[PDB]
Symmetry: C2
Subunit: 192 residues, 2 copies
């Protein structure tokens, strides 16, 4: 029996779609049972629907408080019985209270080499620090910053912008998230 995964998104769902694609393979140890979003306009939803994955939207504005919003989400999760929850560009902070029932089972991808640049603008920040490598991190989300599960590095090239660098790191995220999920559920880069 494969691990049941629910992916959360708020935007275009690039990493969500990478997870859905990797999970189609024979013997992959997880299946994607739903994609949840806090935004109806999130481009990832249409992508999930086209690949035949159930989708659910819970808008914050539709509840009287953040707790009522997390409560609706938890009740909805419970009917799906996920084993693993993957955040893939979800833009809301999870309370400790939300995390508790899924302690140790919530993963997140972040486009820096944590603990560097744990907040926003990670690619510009790498360029501003003059770094020659950058990358991404999958970690557990904890009751900021649970245990790192996996990391990937790519070169920063002469002449990169935040946009060119982000696009390269994103190829790496597409490969890293499935690998971390595979490891969870079941040489060197030189830049000069």
């Amino acid at each position: 029996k494969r691990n049941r995964v629910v992916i959360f998104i708020s935007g275009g769902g690039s990493n969500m779609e990478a997870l859905i694609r990797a999970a189609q393979a024979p013997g992959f140890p997880a299946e994607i049972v739903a994609v949840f979003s806090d935004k109806a306009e999130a481009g990832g939803l249409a992508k999930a629907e086209a690949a035949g994955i159930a989708t659910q939207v819970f808008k914050r504005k539709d509840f009287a408080s953040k707790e009522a919003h997390e409560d609706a989400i938890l009740a909805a999760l419970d009917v799906l019985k996920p084993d693993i929850i993957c955040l893939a560009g979800y833009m809301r902070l999870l309370s400790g209270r939300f995390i508790a029932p899924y302690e140790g089972r919530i993963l997140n991808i972040h486009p820096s080499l944590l603990p560097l640049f744990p907040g926003l603008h990670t690619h510009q920040r790498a360029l501003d620090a003059g770094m020659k490598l950058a990358g991404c991190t999958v970690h557990l989300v904890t009751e900021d910053e649970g245990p790192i599960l996996a990391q990937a590095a790519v070169p920063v090239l002469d002449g990169d912008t935040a946009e060119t660098l982000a696009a390269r790191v994103l190829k790496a995220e597409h490969r890293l998230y499935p690998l971390a999920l595979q490891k969870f559920a079941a040489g060197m880069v030189l830049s000069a």
Copy 2:
């Protein structure tokens, strides 16, 4: 005409020896003209001598002040006419005054992914932060921390110690320093 390089060491000279080895190749754009040490017991000296490189020791204890020590070193450098100075485990801080005549021409290797862990115990620190990649950085030394020139990353494996990790990063340093010197003088790693 090749770039003339003087390497500084205080210890066994592993990276010094990597630079000396890379420079033997036809068409390599640098030659190693001397190795300087602040310690007569530095194991790198014997290695330099066996490869036919002139060596010089200036002990701090033999001068009345740090300035007189840097003064002797600068005068000695001047007779060798280096174009590039490489620090390879040299354990003394260079004053701005020492750096000025070689501004932009002094390189250093550090066994972390700067700006992470810029001081000591870099491998233990990476393990304590739970990182899955670690590596090394060649940077310019400035009148801590000049512009990064090159970086390399290697995986941190399940079960690494500071010692196993240091040894892996050291293979990467051996490859990184020559590459940075080559660039100066003239895809991705996933870990889960």
